[PDB]
Here is the input.
Amino acid sequence: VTVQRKEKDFQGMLEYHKEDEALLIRNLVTDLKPQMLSGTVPCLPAYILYMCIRHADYTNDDLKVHSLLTSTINGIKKVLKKHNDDFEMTSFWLSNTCRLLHCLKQYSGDEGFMTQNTAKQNEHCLKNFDLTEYRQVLSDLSIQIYQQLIKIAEGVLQPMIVSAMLENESISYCLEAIIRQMNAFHTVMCDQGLDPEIILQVFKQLFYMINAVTLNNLLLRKDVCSWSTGMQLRYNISQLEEWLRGRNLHQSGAVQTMEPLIQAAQLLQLKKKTQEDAEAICSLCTSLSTQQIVKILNLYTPLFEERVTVAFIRTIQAQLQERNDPQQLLLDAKHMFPVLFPFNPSSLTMDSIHIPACLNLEFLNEV
Amino acid sequence: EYDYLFKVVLIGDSGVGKSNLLSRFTRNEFNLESKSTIGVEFATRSIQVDGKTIKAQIWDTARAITSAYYRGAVGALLVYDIAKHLTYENVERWLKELRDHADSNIVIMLVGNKSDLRHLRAVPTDEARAFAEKNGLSFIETSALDSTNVEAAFQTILTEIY
Ligand SMILES: Nc1nc2c(ncn2[C@@H]2O[C@H](COP(=O)(O)OP(=O)(O)O)[C@@H](O)[C@H]2O)c(=O)[nH]1
Ligand SMILES: [Mg+2]
Here is the structure.
């Protein structure tokens, strides 16, 4: 005469009645300030969200799945749009979106993603629903958030680059100011548990920018080309390269993206008179185009010191004629490397995760 | 972040190991595959002296430039290769180039590198020690490759600058 319920211990699922879905989204996404998770594990919102999805799957409510994910995605997008300048917030949500996607793979039920699961984790996989397509959506969203992250970061650094790389003499913005800023970026991305492979690619991208912007500026300024600026320039790059080693980012590929600017700095110092000096420049400057090498030489301005002759420059143009260099003089400073998002399953267990009171999700029931 | 910054310069024939001495001291790395130095190269490392934080700014190298290279330098490592007697004969020339461009008060350290090459030794320690004493230079034999004495070399020269 009445369908009673079976008693069992917390299984790592979260239940809400369809009426509260708006509030869930508000307290967990829209109104969630990153600093409110000061002292918890990273990406808790991702885990919470997957616990709600498990329960939707458990009850075969395919409508509650679609509504939950669709409402979350729209929530995140709405947050990232209102905070399109905010590097913390963007990084926060890139972290949670990825971890959510990691949970949907690790707990997908597809053997291929579950090779690293513990017996107790395999229990918590989805039973009824194949959410491949939602993973594809979340994957897309993450590309977008990534691109907003690079924007914000480039937007902060760009005004600092030229003054910091060339003008300031160490041997208006100093090189230190750029390092303090990148430090702050690195520290946010770390404290929010953003995948290290993504932290690497972000700094690879920022450094390609520093390369491109500084080199373009060299290629448009006659006053700034000389051996003295080549020296300061090289020292400044070597100071950036040592920063990378200090934060363990020297394998990101960042160093490699600065090769052109390094060769421009060496070009500025090299002898440039004899046939010997011309063979060397062509041997060295493999990452500078013919036009760029030629351009830096025409702009070369001594401090007692002679200028680059026309015959010298025509001797160079002849040797590099054999190689087909691009017609564009300047680099694309806004070029964006396509990112590879890894899959990083965790060892956290759904049944040991409990929501802190500071999140205001008392209306979620632990099942 | 530091309290004093000391410019220290590396000089000596090519192939005697200046760049590997730099890479061994600043980042503890060494390459058997000699990569060319081009123009002036740099590297730094914060070292402790007294209760003071000194940033060792080491310069490295492959005419106006030659003065910018020595100007301001408060220390120098003059390096040769204990396995190649020619690089040691040349030390006199490098000494003259130094004394022409650097401050009289510069602290100078003769460094016989590649001490691991004992079986190939071309420059007896005693001769080189004598030369250094004679010309007021500090002296030490290092191996960038097995790292013997590299730390002590820079430590020593930085401690004599204060
Ligand atoms: N056996 C040995 N070889 C060394 C040592 N230091 C440097 N080398 C080698 O000497 C060559 C030239 O080194 P490098 O640092 O580029 O000489 P540099 O031109 O004075 O800077 C390289 O092949 C190194 O492998 C050492 O302590 N022992
Ligand atoms: Mg070298």
Q: What stands out?
A: Chain A has one domain: 1-367. The first helix of chain A runs from residue 21 to 30. The longest strand of chain A covers residues 14-15.
